[model samples]
Each structure stands twice: as C-alpha cells, then as structure tokens.
Target chain A: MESKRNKPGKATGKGKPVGDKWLDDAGKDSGAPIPDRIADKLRDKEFKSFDDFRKAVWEEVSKDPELSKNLNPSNKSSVSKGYSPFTPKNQQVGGRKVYELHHDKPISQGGEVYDMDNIRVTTPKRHIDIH
Target chain B: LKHSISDYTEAEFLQLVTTICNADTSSEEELVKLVTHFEEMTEHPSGSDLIYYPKEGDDDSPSGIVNTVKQWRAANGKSGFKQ
Candidate 1:
C-alpha cells in the first residue's frame, strides 16, 4: 500500500509522480516499488530475471495488509489500471476483513507479477491461515 | 524470560494488531485482546500510540486511523509513527 514503507515516489500515483520510468511499466510507475527491504531479504537468494525480482516483490508485499492495500484496485493509481477503489475499510473478502491482495497462481507456483487478473482480496490473518 | 515491548519489536506488535484488526469476524477474546492492547499501549508513554488505535472509551469509529493516531499522539506528547 506504500502506507508507510514507501518512499515519496516509488511509483506513478495519483497526483504523485517522480520516479524512474524503468521502475513503472506503461510510461508510469504503477504501484509500490520493489522495496529494498524485501529485496535485501532476497539478496542471497537466486532469481531468474528482473521479472522474477518484481514478482517476488509483489508476492511479499501482497501478503501484508499494510502493503496489500496499495494494490487494492480501488486505491489511487488503480484507476489508471482500469479499476475504481470501492472497498471500504470494513469490507470483507471470503468472510475476512479485506487486508491483502492475493494471487491466483501462487508466486511460489510461478504466478505473474502484479497482474490484476491474478489477484484476490484477502485479510492478513486469512492470507497466512488459508494458504 | 525478561519482559519488554522491545522484545517483540514495535513492528511485530503492529503486525500482530493489524492482522487481528483486519479480520471480518474476530472472536470475542481477540477483540478484547486487541482493544485491551490498544488501551494499555496508548496510555503508556513508552508504548506510544498505535497506527490504528481504539477510540477513547473503547470506541472504534470516527477515524481514518491516520488522523486519529496523529491527533492522539499530538495530545499525548508522543512522536508520530507517521506524519
């Protein structure tokens, strides 16, 4: 969600844009940058390509509700991504409070990075508990 | 074991609270725990204010969570977790 962890401009966002185009696809930075925090976590792990790197970032961020909210399709930049932010804070997904962005194909199982079609809303507890 | 909030790290406690708060149906025990933790922490100087805090008198509404934390921290003489 870039709620706290994001720098001033990690991606192209609503009324906020000042990052590298290399970082954002479609001539604009879309969402949170692949945070250095998680990349640091994987500094020692092997990944195939930068695509794999970004997918790893998405997989990690989407798991935490705080970070997951950034990709909520209804959030600021999501409009450009062809979605409107609609979930209120109290919204529920699968009987859990909306707290996460889930992937249709597990990143561990080769999910695409930040593909909205591959995403699902979930809660932090349910995300960890369910899968 | 020695006792201290640092043992868990503020991040861990926050993670702990947020995970619980973001559930559609929390058990009574969990709500109690969540509210109770917010109470205990908010009142303590070192505990600081939580990013998402329970309202005074244990209410939970009238918040953007951010502003609530902001106002509470300002009133309490605590530094903000966020601006």
Candidate 2:
C-alpha cells in the first residue's frame, strides 16, 4: 500500500528523539498498552492491516473534534477542504506551548521525546480532517 | 431435513464466500466449486448440495479465505476471469 505522508514535504523537525519510554512508563503504570488500546478504539473498523490503521488514524487526526479548533486556514492549514474538528475556530499553541504529541510508534517501543523522526505537530484542523 | 437461512448458523461465512466468489461475477461452475470447497472445509454434514461456508476465522483462521480461494482457482485450472 502507498505510504501516507506524515510530515509536510518531508521536512524533519529539529527537536528531541521521539522514543518508546513514555509508552513503557504508561504501560507499567496502567498495566495496559495504551497505544494498542487507543489503536483498538481509534482504529478504523474496516482497516485490514497496520498500514491501513495508520492511514485511518491520520485521517481521524485531521477530523477529530478536539484538534480541529487550533488550525489556522488563513495561515497554514493541514486540510485543504472541509470544516475543522479540533475547535470551531483556529488557535495556536500557547507560549512555549508543546503541542499535544502523537507517536507514530507507541512509547512502549522505546520511543523518545527528542526523537524528531517519529513526532508530528498537528493543527486542530489537520487532526479533524484525518478523522 | 430442514434448512432455513439462519438454520445452518454459518450463513454469514457462506455469504462472505459467495460474495468473494461472485465478486468477479463470473464463472457459474467456479462459483459452485467454491461453495463446495467451503462446505468440505467446514465439514458440513449435508455437504456442498445443501450448505456453504463463507466466513473465515471460526473453525479456521482468518487466512482460510485466502487459502481456500487459492486452492479453488488452482484446482479448477482456470486463468483470469472475464471482466
């Protein structure tokens, strides 16, 4: 299957490594694979495989209700068409605001915060468009 | 001696098999054979003449659909269905 583009134009962000420690910690605390649970609930019912599941997640992120409000269509927008799902209006992250991070791979897999490769900064609109 | 749509209790599986078989919408003989193969795989007592197994992942793993379809086409000795 064709891979869906994660980062815009393949521009790797110069930040920390996005590793699986967070997931590991979460699993240890909760006794459950948070990512898998999320994946199970968030995953598209029709998806047949991991690739399809990932694509569906991305699709949901672009449309999810909580994330769409922060998207700014007048400036940079994740989705080109349709209304945003995160919020009714566009808003940016606050000062030193670390946007809510989504891991392509869960933290239980040794994901790191500083790992620039696995992290994505999504706009509220982008989040809803994906849904 | 009685057969209802829901009587066999494997109707969905059979329906799915039929759907995949008929998806190409070709080969009446192939379709019959496909249904027969399903019945055999499921060990349906009445056999192909009465019941058909369609869905996978009950008595067999989900891969049953893929394996069965492959076998059916191979045994039938047919190459490519007409569009």
- For all candidates, the clash counts are 5, 41
What digit string (tens of lDDT, one per residue) describes model 1 on residues A1-131?
A: 43221212122111122233211221121222334434444444544443344345445544534444434221322222222222332232323322334455675687643433344444344445454
Cα error, residue A101 of model 1, in Å, equals 3.1
TM-score (chain A only) for the predictions, listed in order:
0.29, 0.27
What are the per-residue Cα lDDT tens digits for candidate 2 across B1-83?
01222233344544545453332224333443444445444443333322122333322322454345444545765332212
Each model's fnat? 0.00, 0.00
Query: How do the predictions measure up, each by TM-score?
Result: 0.24, 0.20
**lDDT of each residue in B1-83, candidate 1, tens digit only:** 01323334445545544543453223323443454455454454322123232335533322344344445666877654421
DockQ of each: 0.04, 0.01
**Candidate 1 residue-wise lDDT at A2:** 32
Interface C-alpha RMSD per candidate, 1 decimal: 11.3, 24.1
Q: Local distance difference test, per candidate?
A: 0.37, 0.34
Kindly report which residue stretches of model 2 are placed more than 4 angstroms away from their true locations once superposed: A1-46, A74-131, B1-83
